[PDB]
Amino acid sequence: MKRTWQPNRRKRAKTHGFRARMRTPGGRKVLKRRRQKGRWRLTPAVRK
Amino acid sequence: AVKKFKPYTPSRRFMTVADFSEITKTEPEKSLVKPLKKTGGRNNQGRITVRFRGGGHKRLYRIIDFKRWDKVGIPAKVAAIEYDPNRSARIALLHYVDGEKRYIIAPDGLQVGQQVVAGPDAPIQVGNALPLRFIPVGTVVHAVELEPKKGAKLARAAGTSAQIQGREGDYVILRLPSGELRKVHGECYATVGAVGNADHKNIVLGKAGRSRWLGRRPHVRGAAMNPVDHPHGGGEGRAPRGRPPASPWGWQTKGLKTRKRRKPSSRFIIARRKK
RNA sequence: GAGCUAGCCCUGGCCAGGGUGAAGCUGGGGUGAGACCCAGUGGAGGCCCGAACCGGUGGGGGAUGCAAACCCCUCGGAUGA
RNA sequence: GAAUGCCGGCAUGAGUAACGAUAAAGAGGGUGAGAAUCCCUCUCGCCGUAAGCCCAAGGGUUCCUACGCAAUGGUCGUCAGCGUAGGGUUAGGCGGGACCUAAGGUGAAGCCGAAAGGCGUAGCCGAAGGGCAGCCGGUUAAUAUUCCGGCCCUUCCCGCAGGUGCGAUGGGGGGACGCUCUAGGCUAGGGGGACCGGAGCCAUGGACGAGCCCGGCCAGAAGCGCAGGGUGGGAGGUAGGCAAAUCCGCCUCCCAACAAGCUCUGCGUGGUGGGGAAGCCCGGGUGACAACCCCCCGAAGCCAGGGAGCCAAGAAAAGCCUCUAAGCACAACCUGCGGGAACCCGUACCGCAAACCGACACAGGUGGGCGGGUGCAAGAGCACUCAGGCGCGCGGGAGAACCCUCGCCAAGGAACUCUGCAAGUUGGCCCCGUAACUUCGGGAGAAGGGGUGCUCCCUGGGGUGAUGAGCCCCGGGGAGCCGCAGUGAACAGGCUCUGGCGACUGUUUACCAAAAACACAGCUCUCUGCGAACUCGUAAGAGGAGGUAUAGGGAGCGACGCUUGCCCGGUGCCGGAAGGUCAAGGGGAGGGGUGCAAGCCCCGAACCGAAGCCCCGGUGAACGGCGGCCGUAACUAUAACGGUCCUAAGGUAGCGAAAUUCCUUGUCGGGUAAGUUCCGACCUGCACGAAAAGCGUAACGACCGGAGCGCUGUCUCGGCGAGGGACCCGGUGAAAUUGAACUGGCCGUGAAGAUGCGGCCUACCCGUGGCAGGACGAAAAGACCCCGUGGAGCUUUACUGCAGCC
RNA sequence: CGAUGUCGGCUCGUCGCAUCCUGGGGCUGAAGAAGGUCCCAAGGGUUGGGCUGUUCGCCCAUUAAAGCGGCACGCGAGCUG
RNA sequence: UGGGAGAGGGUGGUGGAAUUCCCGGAGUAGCGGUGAAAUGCGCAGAUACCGGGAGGAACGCCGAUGGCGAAGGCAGCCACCUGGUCCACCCGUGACGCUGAGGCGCGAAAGCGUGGGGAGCAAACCGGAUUAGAUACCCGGGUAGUCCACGCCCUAAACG
RNA sequence: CCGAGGGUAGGGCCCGUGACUGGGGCGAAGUCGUAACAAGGUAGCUGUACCGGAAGGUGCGGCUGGAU
Numbered sequence A: 001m002k003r004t005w006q007p008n009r010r011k012r013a014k015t016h017g018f019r020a021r022m023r024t025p026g027g028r029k030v031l032k033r034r035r036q037k038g039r040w041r042l043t044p045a046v047r048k
Numbered sequence B: 001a002v003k004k005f006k007p008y009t010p011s012r013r014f015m016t017v018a019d020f021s022e023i024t025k026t027e028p029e030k031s032l033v034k035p036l037k038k039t040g041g042r043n044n045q046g047r048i049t050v051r052f053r054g055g056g057h058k059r060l061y062r063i064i065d066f067k068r069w070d071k072v073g074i075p076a077k078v079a080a081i082e083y084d085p086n087r088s089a090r091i092a093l094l095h096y097v098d099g100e101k102r103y104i105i106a107p108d109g110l111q112v113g114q115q116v117v118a119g120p121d122a123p124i125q126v127g128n129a130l131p132l133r134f135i136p137v138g139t140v141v142h143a144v145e146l147e148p149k150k151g152a153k154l155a156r157a158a159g160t161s162a163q164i165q166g167r168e169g170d171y172v173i174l175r176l177p178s179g180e181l182r183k184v185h186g187e188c189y190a191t192v193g194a195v196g197n198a199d200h201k202n203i204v205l206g207k208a209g210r211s212r213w214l215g216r217r218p219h220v221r222g223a224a225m226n227p228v229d230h231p232h233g234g235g236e237g238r239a240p241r242g243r244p245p246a247s248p249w250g251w252q253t254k255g256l257k258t259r260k261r262r263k264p265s266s267r268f269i270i271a272r273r274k275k
Numbered sequence C: 001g002a003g004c005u006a007g008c009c010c011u012g013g014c015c016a017g018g019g020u021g022a023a024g025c026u027g028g029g030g031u032g033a034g035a036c037c038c039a040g041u042g043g044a045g046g047c048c049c050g051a052a053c054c055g056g057u058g059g060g061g062g063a064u065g066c067a068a069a070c071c072c073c074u075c076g077g078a079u080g081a
Numbered sequence D: 001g002a003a004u005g006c007c008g009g010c011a012u013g014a015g016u017a018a019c020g021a022u023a024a025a026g027a028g029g030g031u032g033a034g035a036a037u038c039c040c041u042c043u044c045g046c047c048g049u050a051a052g053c054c055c056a057a058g059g060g061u062u063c064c065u066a067c068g069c070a071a072u073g074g075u076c077g078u079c080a081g082c083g084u085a086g087g088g089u090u091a092g093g094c095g096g097g098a099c100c101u102a103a104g105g106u107g108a109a110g111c112c113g114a115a116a117g118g119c120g121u122a123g124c125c126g127a128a129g130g131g132c133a134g135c136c137g138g139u140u141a142a143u144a145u146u147c148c149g150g151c152c153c154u155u156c157c158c159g160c161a162g163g164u165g166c167g168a169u170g171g172g173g174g175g176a177c178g179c180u181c182u183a184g185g186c187u188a189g190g191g192g193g194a195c196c197g198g199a200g201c202c203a204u205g206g207a208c209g210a211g212c213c214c215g216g217c218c219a220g221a222a223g224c225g226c227a228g229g230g231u232g233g234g235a236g237g238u239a240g241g242c243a244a245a246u247c248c249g250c251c252u253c254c255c256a257a258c259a260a261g262c263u264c265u266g267c268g269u270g271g272u273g274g275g276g277a278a279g280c281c282c283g284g285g286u287g288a289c290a291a292c293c294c295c296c297c298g299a300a301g302c303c304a305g306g307g308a309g310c311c312a313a314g315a316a317a318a319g320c321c322u323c324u325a326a327g328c329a330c331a332a333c334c335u336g337c338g339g340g341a342a343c344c345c346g347u348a349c350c351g352c353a354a355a356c357c358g359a360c361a362c363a364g365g366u367g368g369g370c371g372g373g374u375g376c377a378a379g380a381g382c383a384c385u386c387a388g389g390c391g392c393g394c395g396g397g398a399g400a401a402c403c404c405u406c407g408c409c410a411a412g413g414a415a416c417u418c419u420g421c422a423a424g425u426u427g428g429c430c431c432c433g434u435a436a437c438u439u440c441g442g443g444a445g446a447a448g449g450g451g452u453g454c455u456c457c458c459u460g461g462g463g464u465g466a467u468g469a470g471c472c473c474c475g476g477g478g479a480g481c482c483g484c485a486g487u488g489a490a491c492a493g494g495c496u497c498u499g500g501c502g503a504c505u506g507u508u509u510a511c512c513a514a515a516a517a518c519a520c521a522g523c524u525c526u527c528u529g530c531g532a533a534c535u536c537g538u539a540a541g542a543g544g545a546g547g548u549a550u551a552g553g554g555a556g557c558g559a560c561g562c563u564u565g566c567c568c569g570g571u572g573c574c575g576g577a578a579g580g581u582c583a584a585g586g587g588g589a590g591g592g593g594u595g596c597a598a599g600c601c602c603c604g605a606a607c608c609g610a611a612g613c614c615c616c617g618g619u620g621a622a623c624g625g626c627g628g629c630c631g632u633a634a635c636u637a638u639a640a641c642g643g644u645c646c647u648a649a650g651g652u653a654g655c656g657a658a659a660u661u662c663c664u665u666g667u668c669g670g671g672u673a674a675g676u677u678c679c680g681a682c683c684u685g686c687a688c689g690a691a692a693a694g695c696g697u698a699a700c701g702a703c704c705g706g707a708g709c710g711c712u713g714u715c716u717c718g719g720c721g722a723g724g725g726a727c728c729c730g731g732u733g734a735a736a737u738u739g740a741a742c743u744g745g746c747c748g749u750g751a752a753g754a755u756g757c758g759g760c761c762u763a764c765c766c767g768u769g770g771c772a773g774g775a776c777g778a779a780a781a782g783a784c785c786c787c788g789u790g791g792a793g794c795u796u797u798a799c800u801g802c803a804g805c806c
Numbered sequence E: 001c002g003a004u005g006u007c008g009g010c011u012c013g014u015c016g017c018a019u020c021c022u023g024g025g026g027c028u029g030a031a032g033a034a035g036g037u038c039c040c041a042a043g044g045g046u047u048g049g050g051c052u053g054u055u056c057g058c059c060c061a062u063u064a065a066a067g068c069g070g071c072a073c074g075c076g077a078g079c080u081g
Numbered sequence F: 001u002g003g004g005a006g007a008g009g010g011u012g013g014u015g016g017a018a019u020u021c022c023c024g025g026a027g028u029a030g031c032g033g034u035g036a037a038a039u040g041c042g043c044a045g046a047u048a049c050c051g052g053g054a055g056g057a058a059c060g061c062c063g064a065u066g067g068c069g070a071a072g073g074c075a076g077c078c079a080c081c082u083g084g085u086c087c088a089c090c091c092g093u094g095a096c097g098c099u100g101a102g103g104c105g106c107g108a109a110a111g112c113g114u115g116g117g118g119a120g121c122a123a124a125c126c127g128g129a130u131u132a133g134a135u136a137c138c139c140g141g142g143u144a145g146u147c148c149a150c151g152c153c154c155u156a157a158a159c160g
Numbered sequence G: 001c002c003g004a005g006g007g008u009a010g011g012g013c014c015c016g017u018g019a020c021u022g023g024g025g026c027g028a029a030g031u032c033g034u035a036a037c038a039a040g041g042u043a044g045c046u047g048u049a050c051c052g053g054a055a056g057g058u059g060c061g062g063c064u065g066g067a068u
Ligand SMILES: *C(=O)C[C@H]1C[C@@H](C)C(=O)/C=C/C(C)=C/[C@H](CO[C@@H]2O[C@H](C)[C@@H](O)[C@@H](OC)[C@H]2OC)[C@@H](CC)OC(=O)C[C@@H](O)[C@H](C)[C@H]1O[C@@H]1O[C@H](C)[C@@H](O[C@H]2C[C@@](C)(O)[C@@H](O)[C@H](C)O2)[C@H](N(C)C)[C@H]1O
Pocket: C063, C068, C069, D779, D780, E003, E005, E006
């Protein structure tokens, strides 16, 4: 049947993208957290 | 004169449709339409605030002239009478001798070709708008301003009307379509006659899909839900109300009055409604 | 977190073929005029049969599966909520 | 040494299940250390509204080539979507951007919020919508509307010429729109040709033929032709389109008006440029100076912004045109012509899938276009086939039980069983014919029956052309022929009678319930006068609604028909300016503390003082409720009638052993040989009953009862046969489970059901195919039950708060 | 209770005997035939259907007879539901 | 041809009396009702009185033993539309007549459907009396209906 | 070919019969009331409507075949 992951490059960037995260107090804590943890990627990769 | 159908489907049995006999023009005035943003009952938060709305036919909004004191003394010809999906009444296209064009809601008996005019000097004839104080007592009237220069608020639905009962100082007394007796200021405008398309109320929708066309999504009974949803939810099998009949939000819904206690317009309501 | 699912909003798309034959219109009849009857025309409908498409009724299989819901047969809707 | 402990390693089950669609393979020749599995050829089979082809998304080098085979590939591998390396994606016109707006998002103004932030007009952003200029062929191992060739075109800059009051984010026009049905004319696509071009072919009995086989086109500027779309012209007045306006709007006049004219698309032709088969020979080369012609069918596509009808009444903005404003009229715009200029990103490959989403090269899921031919009434259905693509990444044998999927069956024909569950039967089309009842539509495909192939002959009408021939679409009559059988294969209703429930089409528990549940048109009550009520929000602001009582919210009931009775004492709601009670506040009789005193400080009675409650009324389609005991008629029985107690009032009409009846398989009748079910009745209704509606109702139902006909492997009662497995051999090789095991029966015993204790009996060691009685077999720390001063959802006249409202 | 699946049916049996039939008997209020009752006897046999989920029971048509009980109300790693 | 009388019919207007209700004033201990009473209403200010307002229905005197119509039936007043009928004249047609199975139309009240309207009245219904009872008569209430529009029903002691 | 008739299927009329059910006629001396005949003690009758153990009552309109 139809499963749950239905990839969509625009959807992905508009929802979890860097700019979405910066626009919001909770989103900025996410970036602040993932930098402090030392994540190699702050934000999902999506080819645009 | 509502139109019937022969029973060639289950729903055609009872369905009735409007005669559309007064309509003389079947596409709207391009300079007077603008798109009607369908809401679905959702507010600026995105939340449903009015249940069971959505999914009806697309519509354009016809801009209606609810002031008419815009153009005191300038006659106009009744150019056509058209269908308006945003209201129950029909609308009339007016060609002012100005060159300006406007829609008003069409009173009963208004004829294509006649002239209407607005102002304190206007004849007491169907279609003419006057300040309330200048209309003789007894005259049946529609599209009545509630406050001066604020716009026609009362008696706009198909077939409705208000009647002038008397005068008292700066105020005339109207019998509204609800049978309420209220004082309305005399400088308020109103249009002689009753709204047309009085047969509107005898339309038998006929089937569920006909309600879907008007943007009415199915209404589910509280008794059909669960306690998390409604005061009437739950019970094994069917169940009487089991409490004073209530709304989804708990308030009682069989008699509980809800007009605000200390509202300033109470000094102007003379007598509450009827039947 | 509404890329699953539920509802709504905006903008596009899709629905083989066949069957039934409403209103109206025309002609004829009828009548004081009518209602109305007959024929033709017409092509209405949460109309009928049936693919795509959307479903998931009964049974059988499958049950460390091909599959964390599938497969075969059969069955519902298919211009409409 | 134990924690169903944790991490790791390795066992057992076991050479066991399995190796992922039953579309299918065989052989020859290559290559190579090695070949069922790679390459080539021939034969065979499978898809063909796809299992072929083209877009979009998603994926991200998987593309092409050389070299490889450790791992990946369910076997093998020399092969590969794998490893290494090198190569490969070319645009003014295709798509997106330098253009426009949609929902929505954002947001100078402004508004609101402890903070974070929430709103918000313009504006901005935002597309698969609007707008906008490229077609055909060739070429590469791999890109091509991109390179090349031919023929076309767009914008920007500059110049020349001609023309004009030029000029805009401003005004206007236009853009600009639904659904169903649909006209004319075309094109796509297709069928045929005794005509045209072609390498050839004559077989095995015949055929050298009006034979067979292959092919008979594509693109094209101007011009022209056909078919369509769009569009009135002039004058005068003018107060409207938030300045102006010669534009637009409104009024009057004349003229043109089934036209014309102007303009714009489609199609045809068109200089020109291309293409070009079978077969043979080695993707090529030939064929070939290839030929490129006629007839027919014909779109859902095109002309298009076409026409008609209908009601539910069907985006915006830019480009474009027109009007003017400042301004400027050495400018500027418009038209024609010339030269110049023309950027950024994508482009490989897969794309119904082995490259996307499903942990897998996973029988699942994935939007758009093309989708040939013949026959079957039609069609995208079905059968077979074209182009094209495949045989599904373990095989070889054997021919047991048993399982799956499939075929047939004597006589019987539902006797099966909870149930005809399942499987038969019926099955398309044409004609005849068709009942109760009905809301007059229907019920209806009711039921039931006849026909169906082929040949010859005569013949009607419609399309094309010309009226004819030919082609074509529907028929009509007559006479024959063959078989068991003519919708000869494939696809394609079993029917009737009678109940319950629900009017109906719809909706639902994604993944055990599709229903009688939900919804539904319709009915009623109730709230709401507009800054509505109501809803979301602290608010601002929204929705309601750019609506206004024929409207909007809430509730119940549920098409339609006939109806919906009595009770207002309790709860609710509504009304009530009196009275009672009533908080803060006012009032201050009278007290108290302290000070020498003035004073300062504290307590405080009467009395005035809201909503609410009390109290007085109303109200049922508001919550709800609608009796008991005893007697009585000239046979008996029964009780129309009476007595008395109680209530706020004692259940009406209609219906009833019911989706409700406990006693119950009530009693009687029907149907059956026989009927705890069914249907019809009766009424002592344990415990129906009138909008949690009552009683009916044509039509409808994958709902749930009961019966009959048809027909059957359901059954008596099984038999045989097919294939896929099971079995044997080669390759690859799991799993749950497992204290260890050298693991028999009986009768006893034991914590009460013993392989393991006692007594007796029986028993050589080890496997393979099978069956399921035991190992209180496995799985899941019982989902029932209880316990825990464990948890959570839900309720209310439980407690206590809070929002909200007064 | 860190799980002993729970009615009936179907299939497959096996056992007890307090015996339904068949075999052998005694008594009889046993004339015969047919019964009644008790004793011995478990070798074999003990039908098909209508109703109901039913066990049981009632009924139809037969029969020599249409037995009663146990085996975890025998038997769901055998099926049904 | 010339005239006449008439509640003949349909439509649109519109006038005054009265009842009810609401508002304002004045005023107080009862009102109402019957055979008699009670229920009911009234110090939360009723009845009775005045002024104001809303609304529905029916039209007093004239009015009669009257008039009109085919019957059912028709009554304030005004206008419009329209039928029947009678008299005068003796002008026109030239028996063109009578009746009339079927057919068609009209048809009091009640009743029905869909909207409206609703003052008074009032089936049902509730209460108070009466009574052996009183599902009646009498009293207090009271819903359909009575009214309007359109569509039905088609009955009658539709009788002279 | 037609054809007695037989068979299959579906209709129409009539007759008999049926649990139960509707009212009707009749029947020396049953139970309840007293509706009508007198102004029958509420004049009666009437079409219709609703209601009630029953005759009946009531509403609306009509008749005199009503008394004083
Ligand atoms: C309760 O549910 C426990 C369950 C056993 C556990 C281990 C379990 O969950 C087993 C599941 C199984 C075997 C699932 C099978 C597969 O189903 C399919 O799975 C795939 C992933 C899914 O995509 C679907 O495929 C399409 C899904 O299909 C549904 C499934 C196949 C049918 O099998 C089952 O469902 C079997 C399951 O019911 C199993 C037998 C259960 O064990 C029994 O549990 C019950 C509770 C217990 O009985 C109780 C009944 C009582 C309480 O009344 C009492 O009388 C008895 C004594 O206990 C029973 N046992 C007696 C203990 C267990 O055997």
